[PDB]
């Protein structure tokens, strides 16, 4: 599922605050996304992340 993938920064070099679902903690946590690539466990807000993965 998208919610089980680890948070991926990607090869781009920006530091954009995004959210991913952390299976261990069982909730969404923030991470810095590089701006391109990565995977689907990458959401704009904590709320969106929870609506999809919570």
């Amino acid at each position: 599922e998208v919610c089980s993938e680890q948070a991926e920064t990607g090869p781009c070099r920006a530091m954009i605050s995004r959210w991913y679902f952390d299976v261990t903690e069982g909730k969404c946590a923030p991470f810095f996304y590089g701006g391109c690539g990565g995977n689907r466990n990458n959401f704009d807000t904590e709320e969106y992340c929870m609506a999809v993965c919570g």
Partner: protein, 223 residues
């Protein structure tokens, strides 16, 4: 910037910080009302910060101006990272002074071996994270296209160049995107991407600015 050094307050006057509540990308001031950055740094409601050194402390000598419009390059490909360039128009013109200055666009491209100055507030660790308060600088030469192509087989287009060291240890990193690569007083590159940061045989890849000067001029004049 991994392996760099503290630039010194206001020694890179054309360097800007893109902010949306926190610094997310860098950029370069090309004139009192236009900033050049990377396409993947595109965002709605950007506040441009000029005359900045410590991004965490407002010293009162900075200039915070909102972006009125961000024009991404029409052929930017998020999958290939080709044409990774964006122009940002400031709501109002910056007050150019000893701390805020524009950087010149190139008329000629730079050749391999040229030493350039790269700057930003990105991660300083090639392993783990450590974001600086103050602006970091790094001197790095432009690599030959063959070296670049071999480090990133199938990934380098004619609008990209590699700069840095194949031995690793010195590179730009997350948080540096959109920042300037200035060689001989000219803006020749924009921080874009790379495999990790400061990794051996994985140098930084930058947008080849000399290929976009016309577009930049056409866009500025038409907006």
């Amino acid at each position: 910037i991994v392996g760099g050094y503290t630039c010194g307050a206001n020694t890179v006057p054309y360097q800007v910080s893109l902010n949306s509540g926190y610094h997310f990308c860098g950029g370069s001031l090309i004139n009192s009302q236009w900033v050049v950055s990377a396409a993947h740094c595109y965002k709605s409601g950007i506040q441009v910060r000029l005359g900045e050194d410590n991004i965490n402390v407002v010293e009162g000598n900075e200039q915070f101006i909102s972006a009125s419009k961000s024009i991404v390059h029409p052929s930017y490909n998020s999958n290939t990272l080709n044409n990774d360039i964006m122009l940002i128009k400031l709501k109002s013109a910056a007050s150019l002074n000893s701390r805020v200055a524009s950087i010149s666009l190139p008329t000629s491209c730079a050749s391999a071996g040229t030493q350039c100055l790269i700057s930003g507030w990105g991660n300083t660790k090639s392993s783990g994270t450590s974001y600086p308060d103050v602006l970091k600088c790094l001197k790095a030469p432009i690599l030959s296209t063959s070296s670049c192509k071999s480090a990133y087989p199938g990934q380098i287009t004619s609008n990209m160049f590699c700069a840095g060291y194949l031995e690793g240890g010195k590179d730009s990193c997350q948080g540096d995107s959109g920042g300037p690569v200035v060689c001989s007083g000219k803006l020749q590159g924009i921080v874009s991407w790379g495999s990790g940061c400061a990794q051996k045989n994985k140098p930084g890849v930058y947008t080849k600015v000399c290929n976009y000067v016309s577009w930049i001029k056409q866009t500025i004049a038409s907006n």
